[PDB]
Write a protein that binds this ligand. Structure first.
Ligand SMILES: O=C1C[C@@H](c2ccccc2)Oc2cc(O)cc(O)c21
Ligand SMILES: O=C1C[C@@H](c2ccccc2)Oc2cc(O)cc(O)c21
Lengths: 389, 389
């Protein structure tokens, strides 16, 4: 008559990542991009893109689309021409396949048999289908036929916080539950040619890359058997003021299109302080601890772009090293939408181990994961690190 | 450092429904359908459709598409011609608007101010967008900017069980949480003309209707203030054996397309017994109660079609009155995909009140809600009724 619930906080027990093999260096991208799109006569357009690549703080990105793949399918190299069936027929298979790579890495690391996975959350902004990427991934992995699945489509760059917000309740309210969390994104859904009044779509071409990340999330890790890396303690979601239409994304016959109608860095950086301050007030209330200072937290922040990071760092007065893990991931894979915060989480724990810092969170006990996306939606997750050795 | 959890079982505290005003009687539909599609010369095709309307056990359905709306947009009356941008530009506004109708009915009934809603789950098979129908609905309703939202897109006919499975954990693991659950479906996403090798799409034209349903789901109802109607006690999800490709749905440039590659009624009815028997074994284990007989449970079953209902009823040996509430909803609105089980739940409690039966579940204590869809996915929710007067 009942389902027993768990007792301890939803914990990240393993993380895996995966990227397409093809690497595109940002030094090379304005040439590759304008070359493969038959558009170098667009000398004016070409050079402000050159300038945004220069200021993108992305060094390289992994992309599924090859010179040869774009060679063979002209309608993506073209611009604003019917393309949805071709991208979907790519993305509906390549997105779950990339996610299966990350998932196998997480499961191996976790060390338990794949049949102990009781739930799956699959999150993507690239492609839609029925049955969905969740079912395609379960088929690829051979999960038990009764895993409870959830596919979160058309999320955007806040989706990495969204999957943690949901996984927390699945893990905490079901005794023994082990949640596979996968975020997988592939840029074939939005890749277009350049144009001189699609300069929203231009910024996309400078920052968006491909990748997938996977977590195992569970409460009450089996002692000496399973290993927790971060604990999910508090979540919050917010629609920022005066941000209507800031970030829109439409799934159209020409594919997925991308729109910025507001100064997204100003909106986030102006309002982020009040959000964090309230969240920490809830986690550390007077009635007891004072909340740690911003510099004494670890920061897992979605790098929508350099201008967001710089203005957040400026408005909150963060010491210049706090966004280091965030910036390293953007530099080496660019903006991978919902998957990005989980690459950052993985990078942060790996350095902490490698450099023998005191905790999985760079030596700090508490931290914040932030996702931003259409809405303008901001997802806040207060995390706790776990001590090392 | 914490989020308090709730103590009692996630309970349905209110239900509202809504349908487009335009009513189409099944007696009239083969003429209306073939008339508005320029296809009555298709005398052969026309008459087996006549036959499936005859055997559809649907009397009427509410549809957003009018004779005049189809008059004004020829590409939907046509068949298999570019149509996705037009349907989406319809559905991305009409689906949240229909859902806002049902939501306001649920909230009024609930009686608490709309700002006490802390979470939203919006489920639909009709349209996708960013920001999503969840955000569009929150905007229409004026919910607090910090409601935690979740949009479940491209679910299909099992989605009504899916939203309960998720809402259960949100309500139960967050003290004070009140979840708005909305399922909204509008058939403009799939409406096509007829063809003589699109006879999957033909069955769709006989059974699919429009509608939206909304729930308020919360744990620990405030005594004498809030009223519970059903309690969610156990959930389970299953991919039925040998059902690969049974039910596929693709979002294409011509719109959303619908495919049956297996005998869906045989697959469900052959395997449903083992699922129910296992579920009840878990809810009522020996260690104590024996599980109630099938005839002593109330049944809230998704009416994919008459052939599913009849073979389930036959293979499980259910007395002929058990699927009565289910069949009444299919008769008066047809298959409304994810919303249908919640119309049935609403119909069942309303009769129980009207006829002064002992419980919200027709006088029975325990019941089953079943959703079926692509996968072949079966969602099982063991519910408990609440006693009346
Ligand atoms: O336009 C899309 C692009 C998409 C993506 C990026 C990388 C790989 C696949 C897909 O991410 C987004 C995030 C948003 O917050 C808004 C968007 O409109 C998009
Ligand atoms: O083809 C769609 C139709 C959709 C619907 C019905 C009514 C109103 C809007 C949308 O419901 C479905 C359920 C499925 O299990 C599989 C499907 O392929 C569909």
């Amino acid at each position: 008559r009942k389902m027993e619930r768990a007792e301890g906080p939803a914990s990240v027990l393993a993380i895996g990542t995966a990227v397409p093999p093809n690497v595109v260096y940002q030094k090379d991208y304005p040439d590759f991009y304008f070359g493969v799109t038959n558009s170098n006569h667009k000398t004016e357009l070409k050079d402000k893109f050159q300038r945004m690549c220069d200021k993108s703080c992305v060094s390289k990105r992994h992309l599924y689309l090859t010179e040869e793949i774009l060679k063979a399918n002209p309608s993506l190299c073209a611009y604003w021409e019917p393309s949805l069936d071709l991208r979907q027929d790519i993305v509906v298979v390549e997105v779950p396949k990339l996610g299966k790579q990350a998932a196998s890495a997480a499961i191996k690391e976790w060390g338990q048999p794949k049949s102990k996975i009781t739930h799956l959350i699959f999150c993507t902004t690239s492609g839609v289908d029925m049955p969905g990427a969740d079912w395609a991934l379960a088929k690829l992995l051979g999960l038990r036929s009764s895993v409870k699945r959830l596919v979160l489509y058309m999320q955007g760059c806040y989706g990495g916080g969204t999957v943690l917000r949901i996984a927390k309740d699945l893990a905490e309210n079901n005794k023994g539950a082990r949640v596979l969390v996968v975020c997988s994104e592939i840029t074939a859904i939005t890749f277009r040619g350049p144009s001189d009044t699609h300069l929203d779509s231009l910024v996309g071409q400078a920052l968006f890359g491909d990748g997938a990340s996977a977590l195992i999330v569970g409460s009450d890790p089996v002692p000496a058997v399973e290993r927790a890396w971060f604990e999910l303690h508090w979540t919050g979601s917010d629609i920022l003021p005066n941000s209507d239409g800031a970030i829109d994304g439409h799934l159209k016959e020409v594919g997925l299109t991308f729109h910025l109608m507001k100064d997204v860095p100003a909106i986030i950086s102006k309002n982020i302080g009040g959000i964090l301050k309230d969240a920490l007030a809830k986690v550390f209330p007077a009635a007891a601890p004072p909340p740690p200072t911003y510099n004494d937290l670890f920061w897992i922040t979605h790098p929508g772009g350099p201008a967001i990071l710089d203005q957040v760092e400026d408005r909150l007065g963060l010491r210049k090293d706090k966004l280091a893990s965030t910036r390293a991931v953007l530099d080496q894979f660019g903006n991978m939408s919902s998957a990005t915060v989980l690459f950052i989480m993985d990078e942060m724990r790996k350095r902490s181990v490698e450099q023998q810092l005191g905790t999985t969170g760079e030596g700090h006990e508490w931290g914040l994961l932030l996702g931003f996306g259409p809405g303008l939606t901001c997802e806040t997750v207060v995390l706790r690190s776990v001590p090392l050795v």
